[PDB]
Design a protein around this ligand. Structure first.
Ligand SMILES: CC(=O)CC(=O)SCCNC(=O)CCNC(=O)[C@H](O)C(C)(C)COP(=O)(O)OP(=O)(O)OC[C@H]1O[C@@H](n2cnc3c(N)ncnc32)[C@H](O)[C@@H]1OP(=O)(O)O
Ligand SMILES: CC(=O)CC(=O)SCCNC(=O)CCNC(=O)[C@H](O)C(C)(C)COP(=O)(O)OP(=O)(O)OC[C@H]1O[C@@H](n2cnc3c(N)ncnc32)[C@H](O)[C@@H]1OP(=O)(O)O
Lengths: 395, 396
């Protein structure tokens, strides 16, 4: 059965001074208007946890405070935690609910407020997320830093190639007014920015933000009959997942730890497509090593060569009068976690929303020509611990 | 499309174990693998539920990492799901889905907690914080269920003593299970005389805090037969269904459509192509008496609003049978349930499953139903009637 994303809604991004409940409720209202639906048309809701306001049975808490109950007929609610892979994991769960006929329509919601919560509270709760890892604080950046160092030793990845990631992302961010990064970085600025971990500087770190996104998923026929273009409500062609350890081993690490390749392969197989058929990529980029690993995993370049992929794109940007042409780097045209923003487990949602914009020819000055017919989105959780990949097609 | 079975069960003891949640989870999983005649490397997925005693970001991943499941040779899918006490059965349905879509041929489902060892102060704090914005007085969860019980008394004429009969019946079952935390059956007077917790809920009517963990291994029948290989000891998961309701009750009393167990039960029966008369064992979530009263109505063991009378007739028959509760006349929670077996937060719907397996395989001992049940229904509930999960297990 053909399943589509039929509604998208979201809040702004940044320091919003709103509760997580308020942000979630706003995003969902927006998504329902976008889908030409009302609350009573929803048959399920899936959410992911919040760091700023952790709640027991988060999805149920959101649904209750947002006034979805009482309901006429069946309503299935669930919370899932696969870290930043969560929004795409949930998307796959939504497809499953529709295909098994447990729910004809499904809301998927992610919301957080990790900028408004304050630096002290964020540091405490984000570091506590990695107890027993043995990682120095801040733990998540140090975890990714250890994998980056392994890459440099194993594959010859260069320090400057890591720093090129936020440069490229910032060039994309410039063409998105909502992106938190306003002015593109130079390579020198990134390398001169405050050190956070041995090979990770401040400008290479995911940008704390508040924000929420809601998606509505429905069977194609069901939607056509009741609620009444292809690219603006894309088909979810496939979703696949894979996993790895929550944190790295004390002693350096093996290639089979990385799970994105497995997820990507299975998503391509399920969709009956190859990398050459995909013309937009929304790839999780919490740190440069994540994006470098991602481009390899999805088949944009050979294993161990992701750093060189960045350098060629950087060099071409420099030779093109400092302009990063989207057609030569069809990745994260919104700016990613680096430069658009990162509300904890939310931002894989922005890969989906940017893919939809590209597919529907509504991406503006970021728009790819010709219009992409197919897109791939990738969510990552933990420290390369969860991989979720989906392929979206217009028709 | 494809037949999926529970091929391995493992669990720890129950009570005050003074072990970490990680340690309990790892032990349960090792036990389940031995029970399935499998090794770690034969697992292709792991689903877990959160712990109150040791909350962890990406709980399932944390457990899998500390337990040494990585590095792995092939694909391995890990996820944590939260539907409260409905979680173990929710996860069971997700495991079936992973097998049928061919994402994973084998799936471990794990629940672990240590809410007795964590201490009363910490438990009260974290359990009450679980219901922020509810407006419920402390302890919040008991008061939430208490409000629904009071509504039942006003709406359907449920009597106070009929609530108190639930733990009496459960304690009679618990007596015949050596692992159950309750070892001496209660009298009705003892329950009614016990310390008040909420307006119509006393201490002996409350879910019994405990530590414990359970692990299940789920696999396609053919896959399992080829590589690792009775029907009742490794039962078919015939169907799983879910439904939901608000996390906490409205300020002003409440409507019948709030309750979701009936919907979940109906859909599970439809998926399995069975009726209530085909089921001869019921493992029904019973965190408080009102939960069990609602459950027996929802699954079709008695009419709506009459669950209290169902308890009273069983109680009266027990009294007229020399104080002996005959399992064949009350084929429900033969282990003692959350009331009298024990309740490690989101774990105890696992014990409905393990008791169903024991009954189906004729390994339930002095609790054993005769004739041997061929089919069982298990029910998990989360929040305050907020999540319903129902599964039907059959031997063949
Ligand atoms: C969840 C999953 O499963 C997977 C994942 O997403 S992994 C990624 C999760 N997210 C993170 O790890 C967050 C990374 N960031 C951090 O840990 C911290 O922000 C940090 C260690 C980098 C800095 O912490 P800090 O010392 O408290 O500085 P912080 O208060 O954050 O920011 C200070 C300033 O730098 C700026 N800044 C911070 N990060 C920036 C970035 N990436 N780019 C540009 N500017 C930045 C801010 O604008 C801020 O300005 P003001 O002082 O004027 O407000
Ligand atoms: C999570 C979901 O999604 C759905 C659900 O499961 S909802 C149910 C979740 N679980 C609960 O709500 C737990 C219910 N229990 C409680 O809230 C509390 O234990 C309580 C309010 C009943 C009592 O708290 P308290 O005043 O601190 O007493 P507590 O420390 O628990 O124990 C009191 C004593 O009586 C005994 N006792 C406690 N509960 C008992 C019970 N249900 N039956 C028999 N004996 C009990 C204990 O052995 C203890 O003995 P000592 O103090 O002499 O060692």
């Amino acid at each position: 059965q053909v399943v589509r994303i039929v509604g998208v809604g979201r809040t702004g991004i940044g320091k919003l001074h709103k509760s997580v409940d308020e942000l979630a409720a706003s995003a969902l209202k927006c998504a329902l208007v976008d889908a030409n639906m009302k609350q009573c048309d929803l048959q399920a809701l899936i959410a992911v946890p919040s760091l700023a306001s952790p709640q027991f049975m988060q999805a149920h808490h959101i649904a209750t405070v947002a006034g979805l109950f009482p309901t006429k007929g069946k309503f299935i609610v669930r919370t899932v935690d696969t870290g930043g892979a969560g929004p795409i994991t949930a998307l796959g769960m939504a497809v499953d609910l529709v295909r098994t006929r447990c729910a004809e329509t499904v809301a998927v919601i992610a919301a957080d407020a990790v900028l408004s919560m304050g630096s002290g509270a964020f540091a405490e709760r984000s570091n506590a997320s990695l107890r027993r890892s043995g990682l120095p604080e801040p733990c998540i950046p140090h975890g990714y830093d250890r994998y980056a160092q392994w890459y440099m030793s194993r594959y010859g990845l260069k320090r400057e190639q890591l720093a090129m990631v936020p440069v490229l992302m910032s060039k994309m961010a410039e063409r998105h007014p909502e992106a938190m990064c306003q002015k593109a970085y130079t390579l020198d600025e990134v390398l001169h920015s405050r050190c956070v971990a041995p090979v990770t500087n401040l400008l290479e770190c995911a940008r704390r933000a508040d924000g929420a996104v809601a998606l509505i998923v429905s069977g194609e026929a069901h939607y056509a009959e009741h609620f009444a273009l292809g690219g603006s409500k894309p088909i979810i062609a496939s979703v696949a997942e894979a996993s790895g350890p929550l944190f790295p081993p004390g002693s350096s690490i093996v290639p089979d730890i990385f799970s994105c390749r497995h997820a990507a392969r299975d998503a391509f197989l399920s969709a009956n497509l190859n990398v050459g058929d995909i013309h937009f990529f929304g790839l999780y980029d919490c740190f440069p090593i994540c994006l470098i690993q991602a481009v390899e995993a999805v088949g944009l370049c050979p294993e161990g060569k992701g750093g060189e992929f960045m350098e060629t794109a950087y060099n071409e940007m420099l030779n093109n009068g400092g302009v990063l042409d989207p057609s030569k780097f069809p990745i994260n045209t919104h700016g990613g976690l680096q430069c658009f923003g990162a509300p904890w487990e939310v931002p894989a949602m922005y890969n989906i929303t940017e893919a939809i914009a590209q597919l529907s020819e509504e991406a503006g000055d970021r728009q790819l020509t010709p219009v992409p017919k197919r897109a791939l989105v990738y969510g990552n959780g933990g420290i390369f611990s969860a991989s979720s990949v989906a392929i979206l097609i217009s028709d």
